[PDB]
Amino acid sequence: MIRFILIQNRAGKTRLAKWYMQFDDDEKQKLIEEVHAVVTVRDAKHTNFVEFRNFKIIYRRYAGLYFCICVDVNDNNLAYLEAIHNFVEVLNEYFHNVCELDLVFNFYKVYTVVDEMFLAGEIRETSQTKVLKQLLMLQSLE
Amino acid sequence: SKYFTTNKKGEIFELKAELNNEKKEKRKEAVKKVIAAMTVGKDVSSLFPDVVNCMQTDNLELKKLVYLYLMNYAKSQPDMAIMAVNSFVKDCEDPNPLIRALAVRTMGCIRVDKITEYLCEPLRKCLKDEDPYVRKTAAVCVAKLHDINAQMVEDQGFLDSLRDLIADSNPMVVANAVAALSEISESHPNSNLLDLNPQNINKLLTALNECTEWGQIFILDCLSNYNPKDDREAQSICERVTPRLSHANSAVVLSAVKVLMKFLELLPKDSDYYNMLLKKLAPPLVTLLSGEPEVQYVALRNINLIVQKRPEILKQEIKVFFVKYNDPIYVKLEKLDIMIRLASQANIAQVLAELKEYATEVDVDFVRKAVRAIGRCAIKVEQSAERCVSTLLDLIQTKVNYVVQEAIVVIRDIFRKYPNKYESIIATLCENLDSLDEPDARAAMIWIVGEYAERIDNADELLESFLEGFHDESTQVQLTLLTAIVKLFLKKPSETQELVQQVLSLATQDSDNPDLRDRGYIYWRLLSTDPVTAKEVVLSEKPLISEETDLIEPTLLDELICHIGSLASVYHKPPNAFV
Amino acid sequence: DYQRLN
Amino acid sequence: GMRGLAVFISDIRNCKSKEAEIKRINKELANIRSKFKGDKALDGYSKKKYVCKLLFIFLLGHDIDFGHMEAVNLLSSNRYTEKQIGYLFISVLVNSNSELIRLINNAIKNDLASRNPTFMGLALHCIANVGSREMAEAFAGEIPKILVAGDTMDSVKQSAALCLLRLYRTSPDLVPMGDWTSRVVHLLNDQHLGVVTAATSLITTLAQKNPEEFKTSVSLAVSRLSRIVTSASTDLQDYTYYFVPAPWLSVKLLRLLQCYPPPEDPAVRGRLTECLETILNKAQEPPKSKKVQHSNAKNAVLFEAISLIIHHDSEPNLLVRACNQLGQFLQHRETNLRYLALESMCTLASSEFSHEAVKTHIETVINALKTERDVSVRQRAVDLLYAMCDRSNAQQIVAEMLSYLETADYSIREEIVLKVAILAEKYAVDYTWYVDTILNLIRIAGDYVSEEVWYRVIQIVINRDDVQGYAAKTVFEALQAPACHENLVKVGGYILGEFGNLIAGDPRSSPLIQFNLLHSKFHLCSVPTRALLLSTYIKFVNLFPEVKATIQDVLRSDSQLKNADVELQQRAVEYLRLSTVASTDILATVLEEMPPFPERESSILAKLKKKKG
Amino acid sequence: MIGGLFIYNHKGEVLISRVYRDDIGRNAVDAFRVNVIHARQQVRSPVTNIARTSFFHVKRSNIWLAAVTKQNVNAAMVFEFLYKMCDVMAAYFGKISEENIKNNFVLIYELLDEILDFGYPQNSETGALKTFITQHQTKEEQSQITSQVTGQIGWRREGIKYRRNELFLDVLESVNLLMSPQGQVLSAHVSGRVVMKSYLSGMPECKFGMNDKIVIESMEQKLISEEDLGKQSIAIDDCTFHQCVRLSKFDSERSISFIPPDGEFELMRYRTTKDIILPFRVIPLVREVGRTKLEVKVVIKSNFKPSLLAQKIEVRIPTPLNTSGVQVICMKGKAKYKASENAIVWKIKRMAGMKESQISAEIELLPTNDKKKWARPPISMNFEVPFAPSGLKVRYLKVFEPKLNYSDHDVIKWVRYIGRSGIYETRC
């Protein structure tokens, strides 16, 4: 399963965080700051999978942006790297050309869309369509 | 004010792109960006060829920054590290001596197995020069070389060249020469150190004056090695050196002490330069707990050793080593121990005061160290002991587990100095024992219940409790519990079948531990002969202890003396548990 | 403040 | 849309030091406390806008202490965006309150008991998103009855499945096992691939704890898969990621068969083979898109397939080919793919069908480990040799790990030392190489050794004989070495202790010399070690009349007798006493040879398994 | 010697890093980041070993400064070096901070490389370095800098000329005192330093001396002058010096004679205990009312001459490990308290020569254990006073320059006497 989802920026600002069981506070802050310590230091010829202790995080870049998923060990690395990207694509759809200020200024959409394609620590919807359908056909009215 | 930093996208490639520019400005700014990212951690070998192609210049900021990148990656690609040869060998030939020197020092930093040979001649004609900046660099380079690929015969031309360098027109020269010629006298063709005598030593001392901070420290940390023929040498050397109410502070001062502390062999009470020397050596050694914190902690480690080796120096400076509440912990613990070194016939009253005050503190390590200390005071002189023991009992009864435990440990070492005395306590101790979950606590407590079992009709229940999970208990626990039980048995055989039984069994039949199994066995091959020789062997009366409270091994010590300035002292271990 | 030396 | 949030954030971004941020912030916080407290508290943009601003401040890195009931407001509602906003703030934050909690649940069921998409939806997303016990206490016979013989919106069906997976995720006791199993594994087959997805996941856990229960899932997941993998080059276009068909569904079904050992009914097992075969062969094929993602989706499937193959062990051919492919992958331009093959083929090596199959690649791996130079990677490589080792290998694999240890961290150092020790113990043909290799770890590492390693090499030298006069020799030359580790002194100590007689003939090794040597070693040595050198000193007495003078001379001077520590006292005394008193014929009888150790249990492997994870 | 040398920001990133030796790794810099900068186990020491590598470090700002070796270097030395370094970086731009460091890469390096080679520290000063380190010439300047750096007066001399020709000596003296429950000086000492700020010309030979035992009997002589037999003339427990004083010549003649650095350099450290002047007496007592009141009392007294000015008064008094309801009173200055950090701090502006001031406190009591008590930490003081707490005063400063014409009589010479805190205890 998914333990969690992060979207961090270059700076360290947690432009998204998102959790999937019991967790703490000072804990979550640590998780984050050290996730960052890992990810920001990497590069091209480094794997988008990093093993840490008794979990592993699958992690991808975009501009100055780090979309991270931390997950179990028995889990499907590639699969998850691609989940990340497919989702990033749906947002590229939604904001019809997405950059981070989009997720800042519209963080709640973001939350509700992640919710739309991740639940209980699992994959909800893979379809670029069915997501963008329900997303927009119920975006329609306030 | 012009930094660069940042990371991402693929700007290492973009970095290559602008690293190849027409206007030298986008290139300079490039090399800088590169070093910045090299310093943060990025992999930038991917750029090597281009950056060294930049080193092909005459502007010093850039030359320098390239040179940096050059050390650092030059090792891992000998292949394109070919690049520099012509540039450096031409630079080793410059107008500007600073440029020659930057060349020579950058050069010998690149360890590629044929750069050795390409520099060999620049360096040979560099250890000669109408410039001491050069020659400074040249000696340092010879050491730098001897670290890689270097035994070399020409390289022996360099050895000689380096030794002849010592006796120079210049200080800096000789600082780096002495320094080098010493770092080198590691590689052991047994003939290490190489030389030093009359001329060498006299020249070296006049240097000791006319040199620099560090240069000096190099002359002391060198000198801590000369073996003076008689005592003429001993004296005029100790004196020639003496002046070290000095400056590099710590360093010169400590080395001063290292060298100085060494030439104490000349029969304990001579025309007592010896004792003027014993006076002389305490003032500075005290000033030292008045540097920044750091150089205190180093100074204290060093003292603690000195006090141990020669205790008649800070004999009644005991006052000095009293603990302030705003000394940083490490200085605290050092101090405390150095107090208990000196505690004697006089100081005890206020000492026990101070200690009684420390226990009350919150830093757990401190608290303990001091409760220990009290106990250790008991062992140092007796009267003390009665009052100490009492305070300690009180202390146990303060119900705080770890203080309980440290208490127990000490109290054992006490019974071991005062057998036939504090027997009365044991039942007490035993009540609050079932909460000793530390190794030394169990060790001491079990050795106790072992020892004084005749007293303790209870002991069957206590030891046979301990045998539940006999494994997953410290070897020191086990080992100690074992001798403890054969002890019990020997004295109380009428109740101890199943006990030497199952201890002997456990010890002998399953222990992966060789020393344990092996001792399981050695105590089976006695209780299978004679009490006659069993009693005679185990329960034999065992000599006392005396003035000793956690001393360091005597010889070990003799050699940590030889290692005063050096981490050895700090760590209190020969240089061999760090290669 | 200070006071003259000499 | 709505104005404020944009204004606010614009401004909050357009700031000075994080403190001016804090000023503006606390201005809005006090302004919201006071926009809250009293008056005609408005509807849309007002409640939405400000609740949204509290969420944003919270999620800026600040805290919210106040008016969250004055936010629980929005839940049961006319508008979506107020519902969504309310649910959002409540899922993102839950404080020290219970009244709140029961009002939130009230809103939950009073919103849930509807007949349309986003209500059912938003609430399910909440329950599944956070929720305390009362969610699983009050809604645990709820979701099963949601999906029994009863049909809802696919989006809802989905959120329902995943919700129930949440409610089994934290409250097993509070999960009933009713007659709904059949429509769970009927609506697996079901049309919508999202439904199939979630279901596949849930069913994966449920059957992870209850195999017998979903024994139907099998066949259906099978046909569903083979269907997915060979359909047509344009099939269910909605559910193809960069040209690959439904890869996370495949991957989730692959994962779903891995809880079941080799499929029974053999037409099923047939299709499964035939298919896995297919998958394998499609990896054979060529890139259908230059774009890295396509490649990846495909490989995800391939990798999970390989895995189902390994978990099975019923296919020899399949295994061999998984090896072959994984083989091709180890030198890939891509790093994820090397690293993933390495991992995978390590997992693989435990099947004996593929063991020579694997061995072939030794060259490659020894090269990765020697070269790669990232490290996650080499760690995978070294795990893979250790993995692939038998007798032949063993000789080389060991030589290699030994240099490899001439360079690594701390953690790794120890674990490598542990493996080199288990390989050389398990595989040594000649046992002089075994002593040599252990003596080697001590040299290259020492500080990292562990202890079951020196206990074991000790153990072994005693138990083998033929090994001994050699061991003794070695250990003696090796002790007289210059810089000199301590476990060498533990080991040489013991060994030369209880076998020094074998070597004792040679003028270079008389016993005097053995002692003096061990003795320069003594004076810098942890207690336990010195306990060792003492007891050797007594073996050395009884095995060596010759010397006894010097030995007693030593274990008699104050230093060891008036010693500060119990063991070295007890000992120094006891051994004094058995030279002193002791018939001879007793001393002897005591210090006998020392029986062979039984064939133990292997502490070492034990340690390594404890280090695992 | 010195192998690694690495500087970090507080969050854990490198800022600058420079390796003089093959021994060291990427490993090193990490490990330190990993192990000192990050171990949940704060309490340490300042040297470490990780895995046959030793790591020293200082903290400045919140900015860590590490040096690394894999030999048995001289402890002390490498430390003194990190010190000398921080002084060189201030020397170049004062504030040692993340932004201040980052925005200076190229320098720091040119330095690092200069200051210290192959781990062997070189010429470390700042009056050498300022002369050949940018932030342009020939053989002249060239061999000038060369022979100056290599020579015996590196440390800050070349060929110097000033528009206004002056020197200031500052006597800065810390009073370190630990004083038992009810007044008795258990640790009674003063640690002093002579900070000399000198703007001079050329190669000016200084001699120097203080109070040290004699008996008595221009066109700007003082008006009054003593005569009356100035006894108690005080001699110095121990003095250590600066790099410039001819310690051979001193050991011999007991003169303090040198050629000085330009600017604000520290000339000697020294300590005294004998015929010591008393400082600032602290009287601390705690009492009880009912089963629910613990009441705390601090009285402050001062020991001056009649006429004088006690400055920047700060008093630290502890609350019990926890505090119920604090109640604080003052009779001069103003009162400060801080909670969760748990302590009480009194701040006083001005205190006259030989005063007496009261400070009060109250703390409520409700059940915290089952019958367990507290143990009171020492009460601690911070201050500035214009006496010279030892009773030192500068007797003389000879200033002979052979090159230029001028000598002693031409020099504006100012002296200050400042008496700072340091270490200052009790409540028992």
Author numbering:
A (entry chain S): 1 to 142
B (entry chain B): 4 to 582
C (entry chain P): 1 to 6
D (entry chain A): 9 to 621
E (entry chain M): 1 to 135, 142 to 223, 236 to 446
Pull text from the paper.
The AP2 adaptor complex (α, β2, σ2, and μ2 subunits) crosslinks the endocytic clathrin scaffold to PtdIns4,5P2-containing membranes and transmembrane protein cargo. The AP2 core is the site of binding to the two widely used endocytic cargo motifs, YxxΦ (where Φ is a hydrophobic residue: I, L, M, F, or V) and [ED]xxxL[LI] or “acidic dileucine” motifs, as well as to the plasma membrane PIP, phosphatidyl inositol-4,5-bisphosphate (PtdIns4,5P2). In the “locked” cytosolic form, AP2's binding sites for the two endocytic motifs, YxxΦ on the C-terminal domain of μ2 (C-μ2) and [ED]xxxL[LI] on σ2, are blocked by parts of β2.
Here we present the structure of a form of AP2 in which both YxxΦ and [ED]xxxL[LI] motif-binding sites are occupied and form a coplanar arrangement with four positively charged patches that are sites for binding the PtdIns4,5P2-rich plasma membrane. Crystals of the AP2 complex with bound peptide grew under a number of conditions, but only those grown using mixtures of ammonium sulfate and lithium sulfate showed useful diffraction. The bowl of the AP2 core and C-μ2 could be seen in the resulting electron density. It was immediately obvious that a large conformational change had occurred, as C-μ2 was no longer located in the center of the bowl but on an orthogonal face (compare Figures 1C and 1D). This can be described geometrically as a screw rotation of C-μ2 by ∼129° about its long axis, with a translation of 39 Å (about half its length), relative to N-μ2. Inspection of the electron density suggested that this “phantom” [ED]xxxL[LI] motif was part of the myc-tag sequence (MEQKLI) inserted into a surface loop of μ2 (residues 218–252) at residue 236, given that at low contour levels almost continuous density could be seen extending from the dileucine-binding site to residue 252.
